[PDB]
Amino acid sequence: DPAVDRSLRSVFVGNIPYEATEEQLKDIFSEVGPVVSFRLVYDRETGKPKGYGFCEYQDQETALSAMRNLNGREFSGRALRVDNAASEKNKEELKSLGTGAPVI
């Protein structure tokens, strides 16, 4: 079963402190359009959030727009690093988020 388009539909977000939760990230991305879903890396063993995650949109343009709209967008007191989830370097991070679940 294919699923390459999905890759084009996901923007990696980093440099997000504990003050910037999905509630805010999604809100930020919301300003760039409707975000299908947004999941980040959360250490269950440490019950603490890693700091980075990925947001999957419904339209490539929307995700791309969010990337260019954000991409190091000041908000977390530093900048919200946003890079295509289909990045070669982002692939390494996704490799961890590569669980595969029925999520819309």
UniProtKB/Swiss-Prot annotation:
The gene is CSTF2. One of the multiple factors required for polyadenylation and 3'-end cleavage of mammalian pre-mRNAs. This subunit is directly involved in the binding to pre-mRNAs. This is Cleavage stimulation factor subunit 2. The modification Phosphoserine is found at residue 7. It comes from the Eukaryota. The chain holds residues 8 to 111 of 577 of the full protein. Residues 9-87 form the RRM domain. It is found in: Nucleus. It comes from Homo sapiens (Human). The CSTF complex is composed of CSTF1 (50 kDa subunit), CSTF2 (64 kDa subunit) and CSTF3 (77 kDa subunit). CSTF2 directly interacts with CSTF3, SYMPK and RPO2TC1. Interacts with HSF1 in heat-stressed cells. Interacts with CPSF2, CPSF3 and FIP1L1. Interacts with DDX1. Induction: Up-regulated during the G0 to S phase transition. It is linked to Intellectual developmental disorder, X-linked 113: A disorder characterized by mild intellectual disability, and developmental delay mainly affecting verbal and non-verbal communication skills. Motor development is normal.
